[PDB]
Structure 1
């Protein structure tokens, strides 16, 4: 019904989790939700709806980069009237004080995408998490004792950047680099919806060290748990 999502009216829940990898969308749905339906296979960018403790929850792959997620966020909001949009992904830590097991909640994101300069010109637009979701996610992490850090991230257009400024960004307190948050937070606010990015650490970019498969399995699972207690 919308150009990129093959779902009919009603198949998509009010609350959508937004991994980048459509195979993580599948994984998440199969593993966390009951009564799972796949409402979309267009471009292999899987989307699913199921229930979690009796409440409908969709999970939708976004792809990588601002332009890709923008497509999905726009259609979810405009065509399916989605209300709560929660990115669940990873980022490369760019400070030593950001630990491999920390679950990051982005208040805001910096970017080298031109998307906001296209709309505002000489204004630096700072995108903003919905506080209600942020606080809930934070409270849920605390209540369970999941280590959680709250700050900003950098939304990059180039995974491989020869002109990378992450070193300067780190000195300004920025926590990590990823490629979607700016778009999510900007598009959700523009349409009066609620958005939050929750992120795990894929690696430390300035030391090059990977997080281990085990560490990744655990922070991933913590991230999903926190996500599922962020609405209300």
Structure 2
């Protein structure tokens, strides 16, 4: 791994994938036991520890398809990671979706060219691993966390003058985020299992917005679901 300063063996078979390396640090220190930091390259922290006896890693991915693609490719190809669960944030694009709602993404649309590069005329629809998604859905029931299950939009441009969020929302899309298409596509291509669990961090229609700090350290429900679903 050009971008991960770890030795083979230091990363668990199951990895949680926030975009924010400081959230990775918060998750690891708040939820895991006997935490070791295996990566500090580019400040993109990665940690390994235990949750109720099961080994779990937590790896920052950065923002956007290209950043997450680097980390996910390295985790799969160099570290033999099997289960990859993004624990991210998203902007709500529908009135019925509220700030702090937890979303389980079945699939994601995108304006990244990554799949057109591979398929040309084909629209490739990425797909969550159903087993992971079902386990998350059951974990949410166990933990009393309401979840919304549906699709999201993986944006390349956070500030997009040509945004089609209005049409995407009319087509049922719940929220905008920046990573899921890459995670789902790369995991499937390599026969690994992926899922994106998202917390709504802001509402694109109303302007309601959580702070940087809130995003870093207060989205506890999605971590509860993620960790309970794998253990």
The two structures have a TM-score, normalised by structure 1, of 0.96
Distance (whole Å) between structure 1 residues aligned to residue 164 and residue 26 of structure 2 = 34
Once the two structures are superposed, what CA deviation does each residue of 1:46-71 show, in whole Å capped at 9, x if it has no partner?
00000010111000000000000000
1:120: Cα distance to partner? 0.3
Once the two structures are superposed, what CA deviation does each residue of 1:115-160 show, in whole Å capped at 9, x if it has no partner?
0000000000000000000000000101222110000000000000
1:210: Cα distance to partner? 1.4
The 1:37–1:166 alpha-carbon spacing in structure 2 relative to 1, beyond 3 Å, is same
Distance (whole Å) between structure 1 residues aligned to residue 199 and residue 23 of structure 2 = 14
Distance (whole Å) between structure 2 residues aligned to residue 38 and residue 216 of structure 1 = 21
Once the two structures are superposed, what CA deviation does each residue of 1:140-199 show, in whole Å capped at 9, x if it has no partner?
101222110000000000000000000000000000000000000000000000000000
Whether the 8 Å CA contact 2:140–2:147 is kept in 1: the answer is yes
- The two structures, once aligned, show a CA RMSD in angstroms of 1.6
State the number of aligned residues: 231
Runs ≥4 residues deviating over 3 A? 211-219
Hey, what does 1:25 align to over in structure 2?
24
The 1:4–1:200 alpha-carbon spacing in structure 2 relative to 1, beyond 3 Å, is same
Whether the 8 Å CA contact 2:143–2:225 is kept in 1: the answer is no
Once the two structures are superposed, what CA deviation does each residue of 1:91-119 show, in whole Å capped at 9, x if it has no partner?
00000111223210000000000000000
Q: Does 1:229 align with 2:228?
A: yes
The two structures have a TM-score, normalised by structure 2, of 0.96
The 1:6–1:137 alpha-carbon spacing in structure 2 relative to 1, beyond 3 Å, is same
1:206: Cα distance to partner? 1.8
The 1:13–1:217 alpha-carbon spacing in structure 2 relative to 1, beyond 3 Å, is closer
Once the two structures are superposed, what CA deviation does each residue of 1:18-53 show, in whole Å capped at 9, x if it has no partner?
000111111110111010000001110000000010
Whether the 8 Å CA contact 1:101–1:219 is kept in 2: the answer is no
Whether the 8 Å CA contact 1:20–1:62 is kept in 2: the answer is yes
Matches within 5 A, 1:31-70: 31-70=30-69
92-101 or 177-186, which moves further after superposition?
Answer: 92-101
Distance (whole Å) between structure 1 residues aligned to residue 182 and residue 105 of structure 2 = 13
Hey, what does 2:168 align to over in structure 1?
169
The 1:21–1:103 alpha-carbon spacing in structure 2 relative to 1, beyond 3 Å, is same
Whether the 8 Å CA contact 1:101–1:147 is kept in 2: the answer is no
Counterpart of 1:227 in 2: which secondary structure? helix
Distance (whole Å) between structure 2 residues aligned to residue 218 and residue 5 of structure 1 = 24
Unaligned stretches of 5+ residues in structure 1: none
Distance (whole Å) between structure 2 residues aligned to residue 32 and residue 143 of structure 1 = 18
